[PDB]
Amino acid sequence: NQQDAQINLQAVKKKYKEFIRTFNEENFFYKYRDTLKRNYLNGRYFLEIEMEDLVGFDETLADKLNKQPTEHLEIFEEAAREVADEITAPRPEHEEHMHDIQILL
Amino acid sequence: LRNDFYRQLVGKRILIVVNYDIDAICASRILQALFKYDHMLYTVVPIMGVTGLKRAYGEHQGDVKYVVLVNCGGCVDIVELLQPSDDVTFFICDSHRPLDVCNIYSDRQVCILGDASLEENIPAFETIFYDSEGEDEDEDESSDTEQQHDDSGAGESDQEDQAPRSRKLSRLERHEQRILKQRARRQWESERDRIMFEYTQFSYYGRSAALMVFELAWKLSKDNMDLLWWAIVGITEQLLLGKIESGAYTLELEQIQSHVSRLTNKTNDQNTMSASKITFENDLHLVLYRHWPVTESMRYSRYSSCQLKLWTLRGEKRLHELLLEMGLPLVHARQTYGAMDLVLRKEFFSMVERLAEKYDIADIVYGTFTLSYGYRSRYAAADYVYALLAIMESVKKHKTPEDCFLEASDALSRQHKQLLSAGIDQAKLLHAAVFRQVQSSLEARQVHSAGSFFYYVLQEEHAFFSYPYALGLLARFLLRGHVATSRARQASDLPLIASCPLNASEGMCLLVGIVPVREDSPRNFFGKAFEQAAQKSGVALLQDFFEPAVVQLRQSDLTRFLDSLTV
Description:
The structure is cut from a larger assembly and holds chains A and B. By secondary structure, chain A is mainly alpha-helical. Chain A contains 5 helices and 2 strands.
């Protein structure tokens, strides 16, 4: 973990993790949380995503996402399960066990 | 002013917003807003023509005293137009400015917002209606007509030595008892030199339709960002100083920025999603930098193209050579500008602005604004208006004209946007269908000069060119097209006409007038110029539009009318 750039942590640390909690418009639809949870409910274990949201969010990831996507698109998975397992808790008692998920582009 | 007269505005009204325009909707939706604000119910209207107007008032045969029309007025002594008007309050706010004087005078049922650095038409009524020659509004020596009529004591009154007014010179006879008529006509005609300078040689537009309206609603403490954008739309329509003039561009850089920059409601906390207050930047009238690749949108605008002549190959060769100096990749020249990678699509304009100084183009960059709703994407300055013009979609359902109007006014909200991309798409396909005819018509050598002008005629109907906006656009791409490369430098300056088939309307052969090159302030003859042949032979002509530069004929009753209209 060489915290200068291309680090294992910064992305997952908050950025990807909070992108979705932060993904907002009123009408209170415009997240990927609802879609995620309601997908989980029916055994789906995935969700759908764009690639021009980073322009909605930033100007850096994408020209880094194209370069080493093999890693970024699993940091996505890890961030996904940790940001979703908090909601797997209705209280701490009904994550009988976590589970693995697949992202889309 | 109406910081006093607006305080009249509480009772019932009718708010009419005359025939299709972007000044219209931008100027009117704000006032719809204003007027459901102070708890007034009112009436917005579609206008299909002056007859549409007259039937509209006919359908509103009440005594709605606060009648309102906007962006019109120069049609008649409109008490003659609108007889039952008794003391009814009308409001004119039109930038079609060369308007009658009887509408200006008669301070009864009209609003003289007369404010201009031209004090040139003061007695323009003091002799045409106020004087007359060989007239009946008079007395006779017999005792049966021994009553004093509306004695103006002028030529409007008798000419038989009965004129108590008109006290500049002698009474009985100057050289004869009816030299009254002589001097009457002297002034009449010697200053019809200036009356015919008005309204019978040339027309133009004036000022905004709705920036005055912004200042009106600014004095009531409204910082509606969106209203800045809507008025921006209203101006950027005919900001096109080649289409119809702005002029004030380098003065509104003070005006509007001063409206908006100085009052900074948040100087430190604005890095938020919704409607982060408008900005300003210096960019182009390149069509659609944003959502398309370069190489198609570097190709359908006239000014970028005509100076570099791309509808033939060689333009593409030099094009590629300047992409070379730019060093854009061709793939990148065929992915959407946003779909490009980063650094190129940041530095694009940064380089293009300075090293296009040296290669045949100087007049592409402008000053304008742009903003986000949110995180979807960053809409553009005019890509509304070029989506709007594509909504004038004259389908055969008969409802779609007024319905598309109503749709359009329901578009520029921050809400309805699934249609706005629709407008973009429709616009693009039409935009390169424009180009699709120029090669056909140029190199078929369809440029009929036929004397003192250039002239076009066409053969059947396109849904593009059913209506005339697309038609003026046709004429205004070919013209530069042909006159770049087929001429010496002598004859590049003559005007242009163009037929316009309407297979829909039983055969009428529509036309539009348009002007020669590179004279921004020296504008249309065609405020009246066509009407010469209308007098000389005269056949079923129309001037229905408050837009002047247009007619509608029969299918085939034009050519001899044209031969008369040679001169």
